[PDB]
Amino acid sequence: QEQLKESGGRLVAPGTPLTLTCTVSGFDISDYAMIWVRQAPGKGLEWIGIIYGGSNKLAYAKWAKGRFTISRTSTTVDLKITSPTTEDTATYFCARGYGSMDGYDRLNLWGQGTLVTVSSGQPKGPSVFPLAPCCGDTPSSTVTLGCLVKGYLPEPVTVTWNSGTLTNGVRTFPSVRQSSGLYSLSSVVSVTSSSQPVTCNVAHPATNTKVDKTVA
């Protein structure tokens, strides 16, 4: 099984250098080429650079102008962002191409990506608030509950329900960044009124925050 996995995305202040790593498994980097790409929130995909596993060939996008350095080890390829600016906030993906020497094609293997955030703010774990409806006179056999996950930095957080055992129809909305620099999102779930209570489990790896909120 051929796989790629990127790591090292984290929060940095502008100007603070950052190195991302793509770890390969099930094939040899020397037989292929490896390409870095990113996507800033709201913007499109953007090709950054390429390293050929078989040669001394390596190129950066014309616009890079020394903004990035790419290198390898025996099982990884790396991307260093030499002096990050807020514009480099993005998810970075690693991709394998065919053609080890000079000439590449067919980018058919991709990692899940790693998330880089460039900001002058300090990391901050989320506050978690239960969302329950006001409730009317005609009782329902079903109810929709939720959790508001507010004021965290950097993305991402994960939200589960009842430790993963409640998933049917869950809606977790895309995060939005407030003018504070912090992010918020909500997640809601519908369940029979008889099955309550229901607990949202929120985790924020960047601060190793884990919070459960039982919604009443």
Q: Which residues bind another protein (CB under 8 A)?
A: 37, 39, 44-47, 50, 59-62, 93, 95, 104-108, 110-113, 127, 129-135, 144, 146, 148, 150, 171, 173-176, 178, 184-186, 188
Which DSSP category does 24 fall into? E
Q: Does 92 bind ligand 5CT (CB under 6 A)?
A: no
- Residue 55 binds ligand 5CT, judged by CB under 6 A: no
Q: Can you tell me the distance from the alpha carbon of 109 to that of 135, in angstroms, rounded to the nearest whole number?
A: 49
Task: Provide the minimum distance between the beta carbon of 14 and another protein in the complex, in angstroms, as a whole number.
Answer: 25
Exactly one of 2, 31, 87, 102 binds ligand 5CT (CB under 6 A); that residue is 102
Nearer to another protein, 56 or 106 (CB): 106
3-state secondary structure (DSSP) of residue 30: helix
* Residue 14 binds ligand 5CT (CB under 6 A): no
Among 32, 52, 93, 104, binds ligand 5CT (CB under 6 A): 104
147 DSSP 8-state letter: E
d(CA 114, CA 21): 9
What dihedral do alpha carbons 203, 165, 162, 142 form, nearest 10°? 130
Q: Across the strands, what pairs with 30?
A: none
Nearer of residues 61 and 132 to ligand 5CT, judged by Cβ = 61
Q: Binding-site residue total for ligand 5CT (CB under 6 A)?
A: 3
Site membership for ligand 5CT, residue 103 (CB under 6 A): yes
Cβ closest to ligand 5CT, residue 55 vs residue 71: 55
Listed residue (130, 205, 197) closest to 162, CA to CA:
197
Q: Which is nearer to ligand 5CT, 104 or 161 (CB)?
A: 104
* Integer angstrom CA distances of residue 150 from 5, 162, 178, 201, 204: 29, 20, 10, 14, 11
| Backbone CA torsion sign across 46, 49, 52, 57 | positive
Total residue length of the chain: 216
Residues that bind ligand 5CT (CB under 6 A): 102-104
